[PDB]
Design a protein around this ligand. Sequence first.
Ligand SMILES: [Fe+3]
Ligand SMILES: [Fe+3]
Ligand SMILES: [Fe+3]
Ligand SMILES: [Fe+3]
Ligand SMILES: [Fe+3]
Ligand SMILES: [Fe+3]
Ligand SMILES: [Fe+3]
Ligand SMILES: [Fe+3]
Ligand SMILES: [Fe+3]
Ligand SMILES: [Fe+3]
Ligand SMILES: [Fe+3]
Ligand code: NA
Ligand code: NA
Ligand code: NA
Lengths: 171, 172, 172, 172, 172, 171, 173, 171, 172, 172, 172
Amino acid sequence: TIQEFGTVKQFPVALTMDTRLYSCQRLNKVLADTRILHDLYKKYHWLMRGATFYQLHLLLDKHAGEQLELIDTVAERVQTLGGVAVGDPRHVAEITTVPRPPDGVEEVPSMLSRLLEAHELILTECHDAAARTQEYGDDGTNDLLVSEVLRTNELQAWFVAEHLVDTPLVH
Amino acid sequence: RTIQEFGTVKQFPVALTMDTRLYSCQRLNKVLADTRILHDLYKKYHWLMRGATFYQLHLLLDKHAGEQLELIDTVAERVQTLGGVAVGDPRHVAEITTVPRPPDGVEEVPSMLSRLLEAHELILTECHDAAARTQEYGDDGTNDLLVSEVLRTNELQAWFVAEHLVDTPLVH
Amino acid sequence: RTIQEFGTVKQFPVALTMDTRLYSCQRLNKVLADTRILHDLYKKYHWLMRGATFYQLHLLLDKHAGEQLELIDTVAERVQTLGGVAVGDPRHVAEITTVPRPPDGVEEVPSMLSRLLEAHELILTECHDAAARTQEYGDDGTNDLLVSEVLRTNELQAWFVAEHLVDTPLVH
Amino acid sequence: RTIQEFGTVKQFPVALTMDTRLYSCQRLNKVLADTRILHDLYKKYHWLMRGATFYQLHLLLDKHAGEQLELIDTVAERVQTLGGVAVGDPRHVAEITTVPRPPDGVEEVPSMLSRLLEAHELILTECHDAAARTQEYGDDGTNDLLVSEVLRTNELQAWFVAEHLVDTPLVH
Amino acid sequence: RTIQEFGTVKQFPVALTMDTRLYSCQRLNKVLADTRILHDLYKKYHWLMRGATFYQLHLLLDKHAGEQLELIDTVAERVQTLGGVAVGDPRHVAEITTVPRPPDGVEEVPSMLSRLLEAHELILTECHDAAARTQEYGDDGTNDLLVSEVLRTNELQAWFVAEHLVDTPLVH
Amino acid sequence: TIQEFGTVKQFPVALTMDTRLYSCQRLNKVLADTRILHDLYKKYHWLMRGATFYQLHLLLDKHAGEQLELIDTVAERVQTLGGVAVGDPRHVAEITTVPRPPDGVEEVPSMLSRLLEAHELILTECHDAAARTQEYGDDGTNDLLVSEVLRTNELQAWFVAEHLVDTPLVH
Amino acid sequence: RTIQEFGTVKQFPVALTMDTRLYSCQRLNKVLADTRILHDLYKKYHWLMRGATFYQLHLLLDKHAGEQLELIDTVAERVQTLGGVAVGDPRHVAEITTVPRPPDGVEEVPSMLSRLLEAHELILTECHDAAARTQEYGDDGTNDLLVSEVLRTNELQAWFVAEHLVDTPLVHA
Amino acid sequence: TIQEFGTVKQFPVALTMDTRLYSCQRLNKVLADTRILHDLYKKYHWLMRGATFYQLHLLLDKHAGEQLELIDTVAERVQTLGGVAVGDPRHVAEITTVPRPPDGVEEVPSMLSRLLEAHELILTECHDAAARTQEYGDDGTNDLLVSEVLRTNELQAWFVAEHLVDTPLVH
Amino acid sequence: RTIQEFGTVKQFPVALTMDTRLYSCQRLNKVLADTRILHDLYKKYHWLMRGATFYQLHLLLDKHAGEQLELIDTVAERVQTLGGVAVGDPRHVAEITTVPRPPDGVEEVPSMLSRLLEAHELILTECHDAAARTQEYGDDGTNDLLVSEVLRTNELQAWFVAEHLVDTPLVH
Amino acid sequence: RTIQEFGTVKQFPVALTMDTRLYSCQRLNKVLADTRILHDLYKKYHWLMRGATFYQLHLLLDKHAGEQLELIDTVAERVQTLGGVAVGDPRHVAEITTVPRPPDGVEEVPSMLSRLLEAHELILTECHDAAARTQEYGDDGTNDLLVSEVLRTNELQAWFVAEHLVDTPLVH
Amino acid sequence: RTIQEFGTVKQFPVALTMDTRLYSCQRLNKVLADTRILHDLYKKYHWLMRGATFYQLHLLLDKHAGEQLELIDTVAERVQTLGGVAVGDPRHVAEITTVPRPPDGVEEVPSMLSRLLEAHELILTECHDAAARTQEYGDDGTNDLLVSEVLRTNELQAWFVAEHLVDTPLVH
Ligand SMILES: [Fe+3]
Ligand SMILES: [Fe+3]
Ligand SMILES: [Fe+3]
Ligand SMILES: [Fe+3]
Ligand SMILES: [Fe+3]
Ligand SMILES: [Fe+3]
Ligand SMILES: [Fe+3]
Ligand SMILES: [Fe+3]
Ligand SMILES: [Fe+3]
Ligand SMILES: [Fe+3]
Ligand SMILES: [Fe+3]
Ligand code: NA
Ligand code: NA
Ligand code: NA
């Protein structure tokens, strides 16, 4: 094994080893939680049912695609810093704090609430990680976490949360 | 210095009399003002939407807004083509339109949809009248714009909006 | 004057016996006829849809209609490729199909969805049988068209439609 | 349960009287039924074509079929926009259309083309009449659809098809 | 051995009487000849342009030329659709057109622009009159082409060109 | 009315009610001013005339298209925070401090100046809103204000201001 | 130095026995050799075409050539995927194909079309047989390639070509 | 008139006035003949008839569009040399040597034959003009005449001439 | 029945003499035969490639194959344009080409690349000589084809291929 | 005649003080000069590349060059937006930059890669410092450009380049 | 360790003698150095532009810069194809080019335009000569690149630029 998980290599990218180590630790937690959220979106894209099936099917897929891009961008930021991005999902399972859903099919409003819980969890960790990596001098990491991870999750949580509003649709 | 007053037409090489062009411009500016309000109502509701059909209605309302924005630009360009002055700032629009102001906050979903239908019907009524009158004065191009673009677009959109107001079972 | 009768195959350079080609043509024309009715059921419901999920189902039904139209053309061209005659006018379709005629007017939404699912199931049942028999007679290409295109498309479409019938809460 | 009968219009906020809407719907349904047969004649001949100009006619007939299919959807949506019920299943189309049924099998090429032309001319005649009558009732949008889309598309298609029947030398 | 003389129409299955078709062809051919000259004026000035606004005007005049070339094809195809003969070689165009010949060399910029506007106005004047008369003879399609495409295009183009001739300060 | 203007609802976006409410207040001001600026650009696209007509007609339309996207993004941000985006232009008129132009056609250089004045008013409010929202913990709103609203208006203002420079064009 | 001889398979991690892979590669290479000649016949006639229907046939023959070229690549890659060696230089193709060589010069139009139909029929006969035998050996993927691509494409193409040989009136008597 | 037809202005494109005047004279002749040929292709695209109508209608339009591009490139080369491109078609008529067709509809094979006579007239001129312009040092004009004008017209002549071959199509 | 023998040119209106066209056809057919071999060598190696740079070389060799395939078509069409007969079946190519036949199986990677370079160099030597001779005989267009397309493409490809054979350190 | 000297800012309507805009323009011109050298190094190595990974590295270096070219334009425009004067001719760049000049000829592959990494590191170091100081002066837009575009693009590019320098077994 | 010195050519399989290749590389590197400066002049003026025609000239200058950037890459690749070393760092460009350095700051608009015309003429002059001589030494491909790409592009761009310097009335 030529590089252990949790170490960084000597990289000429104008950031100290301690800053790069710290950023990789923070990014990998966001990454593990985003991996789970992408798979929750795909799970609900497949398992959806009900009179709004096609609308929610399509919405959940649009969110999964955007989460997939977040995953790749965050992982490549870990590599760019000289670290090792979390790889196999059995490792993601050890790092993440997004809870495991039931193996079978939940009620539709439970599926939506679970996605929102995951969004809020990531959003909270993201605000803190963005603040701390900035304090370490890692401007590029802070910009990634805010402009991409935080803004994408906030807009997604909006689209999902408005579907849970119980309000009449016809007079 | 104002180089041209609102409510006037200039000498223009477009083979229609001054009186004809002034009249078409007055009729087009009314349709233009009401359409400006209707574009903004569709965006208002695109943003404020909520409920179990949010993504469907968010998307549909945006499709209709984009179509209204295109109508704005082509009716405004028609006014300019006729040598007139298209309505500009929305504070001026406010003085010309008869589409009522909605509440500042968030209405119930069916009220938003009913308000869009009222605005459609208002514009359709004006369009039929304006198309007949402009035709009579010989402005064939304005009549064509009003019928083929403004009227037909607003009819089709009112259909799409009206169907979502139907209360009917979705499951057995 | 008729240059080729319906229900015949011509001498054709495609390495299948006349017997095999005649039989594949007959089974394809049944599938083509039921598919023609299904396409038209999807367009009928695309137009006649109403209710709180209008735009959603309007779009979904058009998506399925477009996919059925492509199946129609691929199946028809397969009939021709085997030297047969594909079913043409819809009055001939009517005499071949076993998909029942819906009411002339507007059904309840969930009855429209149930009617589609019944037409899917009838086509799927025929496909399984037609694919097995044409395979036994050696028409590998026909079996591949019927399994990979007709059967798979209808199975997936039936899934999309049947999920909309599930009566399940959407909000807490 | 039928929730709307064929041949009725519902109350609808499109600024046209019930009279006008009902009459436009009847006229549009007849054009729609004839167009449905014409679309299927183009596809039939797309598949059944043969002879030294096969690829060129296979392609031309498909281009025309695609244009007819869009006219069908536009015309049907216009019926729905007027609060009417668009003709759905082709067994209903068969009861409304006056375009005759061709042979089940394969006709001579010039006869297929002639049958297309007779169908176009029937639709063109219907169109000029419906256009003039719907205009008299104030349905400006229906008139514009019939003229700018249905009439002009069928006139241009008839020209392309008719030129193929000219018996004229191709080489010196 | 010419197979059809210019100025005639052949018997043609487009539901319009020979008298109606012949008249529409005569009017369309006049619009065609003028538009041919106008396209070539736009190209000449695209190439011969110069001055501080060269690139802007070079692009605008090409944009207009491209739109006129499409009008040429549509109008010519309409003549053929009606069974007539569209004007061909530019030496025949030169006998029909009333658009004046420009100098062979290079005019001042404002003169090129005024010449364009004069051509536009001549076409628009012809268009209004032909649209009214073809409509009287019942040629609904030809009226729609002349108004929705020929007239409205030239109206807008003349607006874009005319605004460049306004002498007004650009800077404080 | 199911939610009053000037309020925020309970919403799962991991930000306190006070921070969200303040963000929505600042964004609605930016949004009203931007709504006027979009309409100024469209007004001048149509009313333009003179020797540079096509050039300016195209430029003002490019800028209007960009402002229209900013409107939609800022309004969706208000909604994302559980707030209510300014809707009808008669409400916009009560919030904006961008002045009303004449109803008619002004001189070309006067149109250009009026656009610049509007840009400058927006930029001024943007620098202030970006600093204050960041101090309250609303990272995403700060990023939207800086990366999108401020940078777009700075760039547009440059393009418009260069057309005002009285300098020779030929020898 | 040869690093792998033609007509062998290497040890390859694709869950198919050496005997199964070797047999599929022999059948695929014959189809590939015949399809190489058929591609080149369609390009030959795309160039040499003439007559009142020149542009129609010129286009149609190119559409078919492009489809045959994509079949060649897909079949060759299948041979490589099985650890085999795809037939390379056309002088080797010459030794494997059974599609007859045409005249060097320009034939009559209906003879060109007939020669294409004869080549399709040859390939279709080989495909049904190779599909059945590769399926019996357990090479599901090879069977699917031969049926869904090779067979179906050649069937459809033969239809389009064969219809142009129908002698039938085009205008009324 | 600020510049007479048949003159070249002083222009910073590294070729003598004499060379430029001669190239422009040769290009304007190619251009006038090309204008007539563009219009012949459009004429026949519209007047076409018979069992191969759609085929020939499409081919003639494909060739017309290629001729239209050659017109624009050739005219722009005239301008680039500081000359004046032939403008109105009434002027083309005075320069061209392509004969006028009947006003009405000719037989299909005479249409094609007339196109070929027009191609051949242009090809013959191009070979001569390419050689003469090269000898005077106008390398750019020679490349335009050879690579664009000559090669397009040769390929078009091939596609047109093959349609005149009287040969069986069926056995 | 052969209607035109290989190695002849028919009368053809391309403004080049019969002896000129015959010589250009002969030269173009030798280029064409050699290019047909080179295309098939690129494809052979695209498939047979292996080693640590497999993907990069698989992609490069396919890019060059696709460019050679367009050269073939353009060169063959040029022979036809001149009234000649382009080499067709690969068994005829085999009789004309001087590019040697590779081993039937898999060579070492650097021998593959060297064999491509030897084929390029053969085609380039022929091309310079053919471009000079066809030019002297007045066939300007054939010279331009040989230089601008055949020569330049082969020279660029040979550079890309040759750089991969440079033995040089890649890491410190 | 210079109408604005290099190293000055003009009075400009972008809500930042003259001192703030002058300082940003200084820092941005240094980043700009170094980035100009870096783009040209990527293009130099795109062309000079050789060896067994030629095509891979040729493509990667072009991808990075294109990204650097876009940063050049965005940074140069930011200087202009601030009312400054962006560095123009490469002879002025050479007076400002601190990226050292490479050999005129061809270096070993890993020395090319090392030189790029040293250039990235230089730029990255300048950028962190410029981003901090411009933010302190209130130039939020310049800080955002330096961090989100210049810094993040150089950091990602350095990673891709660095990985190619790792000596590790590739085969079994 | 320099693995090839600048100003040399390596043994390379491209059918041209070492002396021929060396000379073409010399002439191409001079064109390349000059073009590198001209690219940078166009980008400098794209950024520094100002005045009433700012947008039009900003777009025109960028169009021309993108065309020069492609020429740089094609010419440099031709040097490498011939086994030479293309000029890399702009500090080496500075030692080869004869296009003078412009002022560091902002010139008047007509001065920018005149300076571009000067650089185009210098390049055109060099190009005519180099095309003649490399053709004399048998380098057909290099002559073709110089004439069809470098000369023709510079002549066209000089035309576009030069027309903006014509002092001529824009309005009556
Ligand atoms: Fe990636
Ligand atoms: Fe506009
Ligand atoms: Fe088809
Ligand atoms: Fe539809
Ligand atoms: Fe056309
Ligand atoms: Fe939106
Ligand atoms: Fe491949
Ligand atoms: Fe042009
Ligand atoms: Fe071809
Ligand atoms: Fe730029
Ligand atoms: Fe390159
Ligand atoms: Na569809
Ligand atoms: Na219309
Ligand atoms: Na950003």
